[PDB]
Ligand binder design. Structure first.
Ligand SMILES: CCCCCCCCCCCCCCCCCC(=O)OC[C@H](COP(=O)([O-])OCC(O)COP(=O)([O-])OC[C@@H](COC(=O)CCCCCCCCCCCCCCCCC)OC(=O)CCCCCCCCCCCCCCCCC)OC(=O)CCCCCCCCCCCCCCCCC
Ligand SMILES: CCCCCCCCCCCCCCCCC[C@@H](O)O[C@H](CO[C@H](O)CCCCCCCCCCCCCCC)COP(=O)(O)OCC[N+](C)(C)C
Ligand SMILES: CCCCCCCC/C=C\CCCCCCCC(=O)OC[C@H](COP(=O)(O)OCCN)OC(=O)CCCCCCC/C=C\CCCCCCCC
Ligand SMILES: CCCCCCCC/C=C\CCCCCCCC(=O)OC[C@H](COP(=O)(O)OCCN)OC(=O)CCCCCCC/C=C\CCCCCCCC
Ligand SMILES: CCCCCCCCCCCC(=O)SCCNC(=O)CCNC(=O)[C@H](O)C(C)(C)COP(=O)(O)O
Lengths: 63, 124, 104, 88, 459, 178, 175, 219, 55, 84, 128, 70
């Protein structure tokens, strides 16, 4: 019970407030949260477009 | 190390300066002069955004290593073969650099021998 | 004040002073929180010489190691696309001189 | 800390213990009020050694001005008790 | 602007018709209300100014100083309540009258669209401070201090007056607006050099400049607590305000003429910071620290860049608050010990812990700990100086190091260590003193949330 | 500490101080117990060789070479008991020491707790108030004219007497007040 | 989101890879982000829906103030104070707008640097050139006016630069 | 400049450490030497390896001070190693924790300090650096092993040299649990973190055999 | 939005709650050190999540 | 709860020099005509559980036996599992 | 014999190495006795005022008052314009000012010449 | 927090079996981990790729002509 109320009062409420503030106020402005542009590897497909990245040049593989 | 001892305690001109290497034309030795092969293109190697100092002739093996590390995440011992492949390709790269150092050193040796032979012929 | 007897019962034990005694002109410079003049196991001149000797020798040897560096029996690291000309500064509208790397 | 609150009795037994392990004193002739110089026939250097033994056994050191005038086991016990704020 | 001036004037009849035991309560309540009213001048414009009438105008350089001036009077009343308890009713009312007159003169000085009106009120402030120092000061040196504090000022202020009237004979106006819009370059001539000196030295002596700073330790050590508070918080800033106002007509001669004052300031800040390290008097130490901070402000104004002016405004406000707090803490110690010597009463953290916390916070803010507005002003001035010349960083860094050193030295000497054994009259701190310290310190930490309010008209 | 100092140290006091200091630094050098015991017996034998010397000038010439030798070989980092003037906990608990007069400034609601303690406190205060007026006279009559020559205080000589200037010795805070 | 213009603050298409699990071993990230959605995203969205509908019950507007053009300091007589005041205020407004333009371009630069990862040196050259051009123009306009800057000082600086440029061009033509 | 400053710092602080008698002073000088090694790694242009060293050193040096504080508390606030003797058996959990921490600090294969320090030494060896800086780094590694064995030898191996009243006690759940968490860290965190982070630098795949074994032989 | 962003800010924010409660009643009791320790442990286990996302 | 259990001291006659390095010290001192008086005050440091000592390498190998046994069992189990 | 210890200003002579303490003469013993007598008289006065139950304030210290007064207010009446005093005042109060003026003037002259020549590269320098 | 253990005064301190068993367990765990990692991944310590000898490379593959051609 003590840990349950501690998690609600000290984790759940702060994360609620911070998530609300980030999702509805900080990201209302441009460039406030900037991501990394995740890596693209050959053979991947993109969720947005659906196209497939071409593979490598089939290099000679041994050992 | 022995080469440092040779260069700093022996004749400096005997062995190369690593900053100025190479000092001879590439095809000076043999005329076949094959060029190195690059597997990863510009765009895919930029999209992987590896690093500027990781963007060498070993890039494609690094692409595959990163591809495994991303795909099999919780099993961080899953892809060990591609780690070995990238290490082997880098080992071959370092061996090639060592061969370049040795070749330049031997060319310097032979050039000094030709110079002293010409000096002996002139004095004769 | 660090040289005063710490086992004597001073009226001001932390400052090591008595009530009516005359106060040194520079008391606030000698307050055990600041410069002290207590005798040392080694002489001041000897310590100065040794510390100075060590620092100067270290600086000289770092300069010498700069003159005589260390490295490995290898040539320069090779990079494929004109030494990554486009990825290091760029300027694509110049078309620099190509550099071809040697297969050995 | 967890240091037990040492008492006058414990101090007295420990002082007498340290003195009984000193082979220059025969234990059956030792007493709480026995003088070091005259009842036990000891030199001043022996008294300095005894003071250092007490210092090493109780974990604190006695200044020379106070230590040089402690000539009985009872005096040592009293000094230690007054330093350590011992009630009973 | 009369909505602030008239209540300040009404403070006098309200004081003199108050009951014998109601003067402090009424004065404090109505001074706090006047501060609340004055707080609505902070709504400034990015355009010209708040030109109320032909006589008074408001600026984002003027408004923070006005708010600080209004806020200082209630604190001065609270600080003066204690040592004036055994005093007759008429003389307490006269003291409060001096404080109210000084506030009125300062409020009219800071708006003052005219340079002659500014000069008249700028010098009118000199009288109540002189009376306060020479009348309700404890030591026999107060008279001497007053003499110094007077003549120094007039030594700089009579030439200014001459220059002022001279300017109006050539320009035709001394209104700040016409002066700014119709400014013309000042030629590199002997006549113009002496006009520049006459315009500058009056404000330079009041900062004070390092060479001309001798009156300040005397006046602060000799004055009562309210006198010290107003001297350190507001009266030192009159020189900065005047220099910022008047340097508009001194270009481009400021480029050449500023060198001696820049060197004096950059070296004297090091000098006074080092002086603070060997000081046996709390009030004298705090006075020398004030001299160092105002040296930095002088450098800022002489460099004359946007970042310089912003940093100068921020540093003036921050120093006013911090120095007033430091003097109040030292006075709380003095009212118990009656000695004013730093080494005497020691280890006060063990006896007065909350006051030790107040001491720690005041020392931290004097030390310019980020993100306090003290450091905002310090850093803006330092960056402007670096752009002026990259070698200034040496002197600025030395000043920062020495400042940290003497601030923590003052904290450690008084609060840490072992208490003095024979001092047994140290009573628990009163609610009045704790509230005084809180009312000093909470505004600083609130101002760090909205720094643009104290960054001036070049923000 | 407790005992009053004299005008000067005698020769045998200096010798005994050198003996203690030398043995302490020797055990600092000799970490292990048996090695220290051996070298301490050697040091004691070296000390008691000149034990019966009667020439005071030659004895003072000695102890000078001895102190010079000590300073040459003095172990620049000797062992110090933690609460000694150089130890790691020398003045650690001084910030917890509060004077007894502070209790006079407690609020009545604070003194309402602990009533027996405060009652004993006024008992002590009355004792002090009477004893002091007696002590001033006792010290006045016992002190030689021209002022004291040594900072030693007399004991109580009558029946109801208390030792003069006893209050601030008896009411020391504690070694470990908290 | 519609709260800002996509042209003033452009962004790339943001292509995202698809998950391609090579093993059947359950990862913690998906399960943990699912419980995060359930425990945080849902109540926050409910609270936002309530707040937005309360806002929609009471809809009111504010406007962006429009300032017309006034003659600038170049069209003002030497002592005519009314036109000088109007021109000075207009110049100050234009100065602040220029500051905000520089701020916008700097924000573009910072966002590009963070977004492009290890490829920022090559993939942010356009924003670097934009900032170079705008910084050059702003420095030409306002760099050395100092405190107590004015429209007259800015005009004098521009005139001095124009004399230098005309002299250089005449020298080049006649060289 | 960064490389030379790091080299002189690590050498000088290890040299001061190998002769100290306060245990906390020895551990502080060890910390300063480790910071100098971090600066050397920065100076040879290896920032990610320096960060990894920061992360590993956190674990094992925090556990080292915790063990030292346990010893100090059990011996009545005594910090001099001349007055602590045989604690190998008298208080064994502290003994095993300190042994593990020292083995991680000096660099024992597959512990937390290995995955960072071994790579540090290899990278410094395989680089175009000052010869003096390389020499000072190797001597500092020697001195690290030296002061580690100094602590162990003088605090755990001999006969007791503390006062007769034995108040040695380890039985507190707080002390045991707090120390054992960082012990598990000092054992496994290097492997886990090194295998989970992406590669940020080219590896030194090929070396002379002797020059691969330089760190171990010096230790 | 993305969870990764929220978790990073929550760790630092919940590190500050005991400082806010430093004026409350719990600061006058003997349970304050355990409260601080529990807060730090919860912050650690919460910060483990962005590390997993980055990995 | 504190340790109030009336601890008593052991017998002082128990502490002896025999079988300890203090015996060697006494023997070496006797060859010079000297004697160690405080020997029995130091005997308890070599008497009880403090009598047995361990070397440095023995300390470093604190738990090598059990770890080695577990390692052999684990490698055998892996060998018998992979070969299937 | 052993290597000698040489005292300095900041590492003084140890007490046990002074030739003075070992030169005992009746005048030396008498001087020590009078020093102890003065210290004991001062200690007696202090403790008498300290243990007083009626005293409720600071015990004023004439030595501290003399120290502060000598440090602060007795300087100028005892000042005499002397070649040493005049030269030290001129040096320490004027030389640093002219040194710093020369340094900053040279720096700013070099910067101004460079900016006139156009070879300063002030790109991205917007804030001053 | 723990159990009650009395002072001992010149004798070996009282030892609980729990601390002994935990210390032994953790020491054995460390040694087992070291042995397991050495068995599984020994090339991180000894090295995996051979170091080539520069003098073993013939002039044919290194591009050297017998001192007269060029
Ligand atoms: C860190 C975030 C915390 C968030 C929680 C909210 C905290 C609100 C505090 C507001 C300001 C304090 C008011 C001053 C008076 C002190 C109060 C008092 O009387 O104490 C009695 C009260 C009752 O205890 P008691 O036992 O009865 O009293 C016994 C004695 O008093 C003995 O008491 P003591 O021994 O316990 O000591 C008293 C204590 C209190 O005394 C103080 O010294 C407090 C003042 C410290 C500032 C010093 C000046 C430097 C300028 C910095 C400006 C920061 C202000 C920001 C805006 C403020 C808005 C008003 O002193 C300290 O503990 C030393 C702290 C040193 C702090 C140095 C770090 C500064 C920079 C930190 C980052 C700030 C910006 C972050 C930006 C980036 C991230 C977003 O004790 C307290 O409440 C202690 C206060 C908490 C400590 C303050 C340290 C953190 C707060 C910094 C300011 C606000 C941060 C905002 C960011 C939030 C995210
Ligand atoms: C004491 C505590 C601080 C108080 C405040 C101190 C600050 C006041 C310092 C005054 C600033 C400088 C004054 C004049 C500066 C102009 C530059 C000039 O002095 O230098 C040379 C001038 O040469 C010589 O210096 C001529 C003047 C020499 C006579 C002055 C006395 C020198 C020392 C006196 C100092 C005493 C100051 C305090 C008086 C009470 C420049 O050569 P030149 O190209 O030709 O002149 C250009 C200027 N023109 C065009 C207007 C003519
Ligand atoms: C340039 C800086 C000049 C130094 C400013 C000196 C300020 C003087 C006033 C300080 C107040 C006096 C004081 O603090 O007391 C000294 C106090 C007490 O001595 P303890 O050793 O602690 O003894 C305690 C045991 N009884 O110790 C100190 O803090 C003195 C510190 C003085 C340091 C000055 C020397 C610094 C030189 C650094 C040069 C190297 C720079 C690094 C280069 C890096 C380049 C990449
Ligand atoms: C006392 C006599 C001071 C002598 C200074 C002479 C300065 C002077 O006359 O300049 C006048 C000048 C204009 O020149 P004109 O004579 O009108 O015409 C010249 C072109 N045909 O007018 C002015 O600027 C007057 C300004 C007042 C002059 C300054 C007088 C005092 C010296 C300057 C102030 C510096 C000292 C301040 C003391 C500070 C102590 C804290
Ligand atoms: C490792 C650090 C280096 C240390 C080296 C120090 C040098 C050691 C050698 C010292 C040389 C001497 O003996 S110094 C010789 C000084 N002169 C005398 O000793 C003459 C008479 N002796 C006394 O009076 C004594 O007090 C005595 C009778 C012993 C006791 O007296 P008690 O009856 O009151 O116990």
């Amino acid at each position: 019970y003590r840990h349950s109320i501690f998690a609600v009062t000290h984790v759940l409420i702060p994360v609620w407030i911070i998530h609300y503030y980030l999702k509805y106020h900080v990201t209302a402005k441009p460039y406030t949260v900037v991501e990394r542009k995740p890596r693209i590897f050959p053979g991947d497909t993109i969720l947005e477009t659906g196209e497939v990245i071409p593979l490598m040049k089939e290099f000679p593989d041994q050992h | 190390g022995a080469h440092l001892a040779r260069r700093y305690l022996g004749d400096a001109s005997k062995e190369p300066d690593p900053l100025r290497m190479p000092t001879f034309p590439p095809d000076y030795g043999f005329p076949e002069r094959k060029e190195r092969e690059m597997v990863a293109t510009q765009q895919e190697m930029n999209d992987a955004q590896l690093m500027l100092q990781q963007r060498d002739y070993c890039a494609h093996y690094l692409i595959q290593l990163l591809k495994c590390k991303r795909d099999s995440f919780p099993n961080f011992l899953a892809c060990k073969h591609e780690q070995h492949d990238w290490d082997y390709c880098e080992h071959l790269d370092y061996v090639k650099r060592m061969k370049e150092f040795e070749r330049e050193r031997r060319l310097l040796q032979r050039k000094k021998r030709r110079e002293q032979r010409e000096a002996e012929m002139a004095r004769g | 004040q660090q040289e005063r007897d710490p086992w004597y019962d001073w009226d001001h034990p932390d400052l090591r002073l008595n009530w009516g005694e005359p106060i040194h002109w520079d008391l606030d410079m000698y307050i055990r929180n600041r410069v002290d003049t207590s005798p040392t196991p080694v002489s001041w001149n000897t310590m100065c010489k040794h510390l100075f000797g060590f620092v100067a020798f270290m600086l000289f040897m770092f300069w010498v190691g700069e003159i005589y560096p260390s490295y490995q029996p290898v040539g320069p690291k090779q990079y494929p696309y004109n030494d990554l000309y486009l990825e290091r500064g760029g300027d694509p509208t110049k078309e620099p001189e190509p550099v071809v790397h040697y297969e050995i | 800390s967890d240091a037990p609150p040492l008492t006058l009795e414990a101090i007295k037994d420990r002082v007498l213990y340290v003195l009984k392990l000193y082979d220059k004193i025969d234990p059956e002739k030792l007493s709480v009020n026995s003088h070091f110089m005259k009842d036990l026939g000891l030199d001043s250097l022996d008294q300095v050694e005894i003071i250092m033994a007490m210092e090493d056994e109780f974990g604190f050191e006695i200044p020379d001005i106070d230590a040089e005038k402690l000539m009985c086991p009872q005096e040592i016990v009293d000094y230690i008790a007054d330093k350590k704020d011992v009630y009973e | 602007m009369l909505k602030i001036i008239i209540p300040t004037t009404m403070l006098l009849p309200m004081t003199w018709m108050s009951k014998h035991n109601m003067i402090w309560i009424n004065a404090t309540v109505h001074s706090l209300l006047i501060s609340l009213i004055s707080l609505s001048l902070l709504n400034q414009l990015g355009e010209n100014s708040l030109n109320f009438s032909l006589t008074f105008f408001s600026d984002s350089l003027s408004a923070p100083l006005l708010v600080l001036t209004t806020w200082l009077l209630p604190l001065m009343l609270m600080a003066s309540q204690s040592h004036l308890s055994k005093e007759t009713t008429t003389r307490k009312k006269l003291y409060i009258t001096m404080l109210i007159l000084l506030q009125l003169f300062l409020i009219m000085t800071f708006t003052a669209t005219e340079l002659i009106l500014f000069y008249i009120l700028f010098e009118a402030t000199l009288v109540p401070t002189l009376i306060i120092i020479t009348r309700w000061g404890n030591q026999t040196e107060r008279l001497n201090a007053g003499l110094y504090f007077l003549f120094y000022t007039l030594a700089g202020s009579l030439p200014l007056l001459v220059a002022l009237v001279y300017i109006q004979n050539t320009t035709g106006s001394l209104n700040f607006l016409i002066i700014h819009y119709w400014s013309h370059p000042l030629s590199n001539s002997w006549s113009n050099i002496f006009m520049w000196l006459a315009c500058i030295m009056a404000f330079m002596v009041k900062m004070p400049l390092y060479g001309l700073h001798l009156w300040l330790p005397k006046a602060h050590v000799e004055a009562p607590i309210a006198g010290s508070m107003v001297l350190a918080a507001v009266l030192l800033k009159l020189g900065g305000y005047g220099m910022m106002r008047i340097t508009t007509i001194l270009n481009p001669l400021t480029n050449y003429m500023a060198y001696p004052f820049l060197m004096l300031s950059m070296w004297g800040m090091i000098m006074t910071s080092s002086i603070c390290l060997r000081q046996t008097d709390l009030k004298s130490l705090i006075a020398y620290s004030s001299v160092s901070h105002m040296a930095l402000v002088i450098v800022a104004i002489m460099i004359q860049t946007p970042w310089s002016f912003m940093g100068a405004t921020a540093l003036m406000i921050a120093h006013g608050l911090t120095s007033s707090m430091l003097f109040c803490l030292a006075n709380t110690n003095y009212e118990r010990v009656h000695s004013r010597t730093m080494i005497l009463a020691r280890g006060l953290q063990t006896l007065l812990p909350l006051m030790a916390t107040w001491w720690l916070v005041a020392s931290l803010t004097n030390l310019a700990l980020p993100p306090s507005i003290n450091l905002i002003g310090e850093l803006f001035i330092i960056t402007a100086s670096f752009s002026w010349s990259n070698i200034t960083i040496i002197l600025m860094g030395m000043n920062m190091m020495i400042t940290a050193l003497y601030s923590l030295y003052m904290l450690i000497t008084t609060q840490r260590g072992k208490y003095t054994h024979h001092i047994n009259n140290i009573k628990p701190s009163f609610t009045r003193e704790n509230a005084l310290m809180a009312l000093h310190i909470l505004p600083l930490l609130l101002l760090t949330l909205n720094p643009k309010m104290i960054l001036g008209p070049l923000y | 500490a407790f005992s009053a100092p004299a005008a000067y140290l005698t020769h045998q006091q200096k010798v005994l101080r050198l003996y203690k200091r030398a043995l302490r630094h020797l055990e600092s050098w000799c970490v292990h117990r048996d090695k220290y015991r051996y070298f301490a017996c050697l040091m004691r034998a070296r000390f008691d060789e000149h034990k019966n010397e009667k020439d005071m000038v030659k004895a003072t010439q000695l102890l000078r070479q001895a102190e010079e030798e000590f300073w040459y070989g003095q172990h620049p980092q000797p062992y110090i008991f933690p609460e000694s003037p150089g130890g790691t906990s020398y003045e650690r608990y001084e910030c917890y020491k509060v004077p007894e007069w502070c209790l006079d400034d407690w609020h009545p609601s604070e003194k309402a707790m602990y009533p027996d303690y405060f009652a004993k406190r006024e008992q002590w205060k009355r004792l002090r108030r009477e004893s002091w007026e007696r002590e001033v006279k006792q010290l006045q009559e016992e002190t030689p004219p021209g002022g004291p020559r040594t900072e030693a205080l007399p004991p109580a000589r009558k029946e109801g007497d208390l030792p003069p200037l006893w209050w601030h010795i008896v009411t020391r805070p504690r070694e470990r007040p908290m | 989101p519609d709260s800002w213009d996509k042209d003033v603050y452009p962004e790339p298409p943001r292509r995202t890879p698809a998950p391609a699990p090579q093993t059947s071993l359950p990862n913690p990230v998906t399960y943990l982000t699912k419980i995060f959605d359930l425990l945080v995203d849902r109540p926050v969205t409910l609270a936002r829906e309530f707040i937005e509908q309360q806002h929609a019950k009471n809809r009111y507007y504010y406007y962006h103030r429009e300032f017309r053009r006034v003659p600038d300091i170049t069209e003002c007589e030497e002592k005519d104070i009314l036109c000088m005041f109007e021109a000075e205020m207009q110049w100050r407004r234009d100065y602040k707008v220029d500051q905000e333009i520089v701020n916008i371009i700097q924000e573009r630069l910072k966002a590009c640097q963070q977004r492009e990862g290890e490829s920022y040196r090559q993939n942010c050259a356009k924003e670097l050139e934009q900032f170079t051009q705008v910084s050059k123009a702003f420095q030409d306009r306002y760099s050395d006016l100092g405190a107590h800057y004015s429209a007259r000082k800015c005009l004098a600086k521009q005139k001095q630069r124009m004399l230098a440029e005309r002299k250089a061009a005449k020298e080049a033509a006649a060289a | 400049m960064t490389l030379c400053l790091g080299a002189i710092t690590t050498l000088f602080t290890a040299l001061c450490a190998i002769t100290q008698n306060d245990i906390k002073k020895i551990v502080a000088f060890s910390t300063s030497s480790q910071l100098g090694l971090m600066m050397v790694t920065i100076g040879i242009n290896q920032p990610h390896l320096a960060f990894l060293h920061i992360c590993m050193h956190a674990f094992f040096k925090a556990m080292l001070f915790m063990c030292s504080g346990s010893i100090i508390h059990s011996l009545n606030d005594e910090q001099d190693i001349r007055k602590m003797g045989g604690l190998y058996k008298a208080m064994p959990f502290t003994t095993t924790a300190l042994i593990i921490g020292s083995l991680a600090l000096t660099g024992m294969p597959y512990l937390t300090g290995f995955y960072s320090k071994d790579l540090i030494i290899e990278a410094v060896n395989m680089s175009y650096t000052n010869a003096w800086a390389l020499l000072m780094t190797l001597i500092a590694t020697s001195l690290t092993a030296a002061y580690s064995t100094r602590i162990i030898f003088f605090a755990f191996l001999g006969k007791p040299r503390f006062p007769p009243l034995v108040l040695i006690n380890e039985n507190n759940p707080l002390l045991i649990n707090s120390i054992k968490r960082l012990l598990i860290g000092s054992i496994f965190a290097g492997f886990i973190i090194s295998n989970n982070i992406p590669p940020m630098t080219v590896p030194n795949t090929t070396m002379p055999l002797y020059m691969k074994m330089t760190a171990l032989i010096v230790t | 939005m993305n969870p990764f962003a929220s978790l990073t800010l929550t760790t630092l924010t919940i590190l500050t709650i005991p400082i806010m409660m430093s004026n409350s009643n719990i600061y006058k009791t003997n349970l304050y050190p355990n409260y601080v320790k529990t807060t730090v442990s919860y912050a650690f286990t919460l910060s483990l999540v962005p590390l997993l996302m980055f990995m | 709860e504190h340790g109030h259990s009336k601890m008593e001291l052991p017998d002082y006659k128990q502490w002896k020099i025999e079988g300890t390095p203090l015996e060697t010290v006494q023997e070496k001192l006797a060859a010079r005509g000297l004697r160690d008086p405080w020997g029995r005050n130091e005997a308890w440091r070599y008497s009880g559980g403090f009598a047995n000592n361990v070397s440095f390498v023995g300390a470093l190998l604190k738990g090598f036996k059990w770890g080695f046994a577990a390692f052999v069992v684990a490698v055998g189990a892996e060998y018998y599992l992979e070969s299937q | 014999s052993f290597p000698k210890y040489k005292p300095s200003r900041l590492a003084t002579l140890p007490a046990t190495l002074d030739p003075a303490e070992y030169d005992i003469s009746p005048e030396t013993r008498k001087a020590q006795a009078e020093r102890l007598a003065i210290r004991s008289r001062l200690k007696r006065e202090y403790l008498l005022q300290y243990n007083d139950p009626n005293r409720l304030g600071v015990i004023e210290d004439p030595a501290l008052i003399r120290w502060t007064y000598a440090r602060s207010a007795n300087i100028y009446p005892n000042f005499r314009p002397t070649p040493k005093t005049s030269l030290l005042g001129a040096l320490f109060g004027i030389g640093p000012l002219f040194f710093w003026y020369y340094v900053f003037k040279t720096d700013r002259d070099k910067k101004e010449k460079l900016i006139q020549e156009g070879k300063l590269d002030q790109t991205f320098n917007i804030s001053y | 927090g723990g159990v009650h253990i009395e002072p001992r005064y010149r004798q070996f301190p009282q030892l609980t079996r729990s601390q002994l068993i935990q210390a032994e367990f953790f020491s054995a765990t460390m040694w087992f981990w070291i042995l397991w990692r050495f068995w599984h991944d020994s090339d991180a310590v000894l090295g995996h790729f051979p170091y080539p000898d520069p003098s073993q490379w013939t002039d044919e593959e290194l591009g050297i002509l017998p001192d007269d051609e060029d």
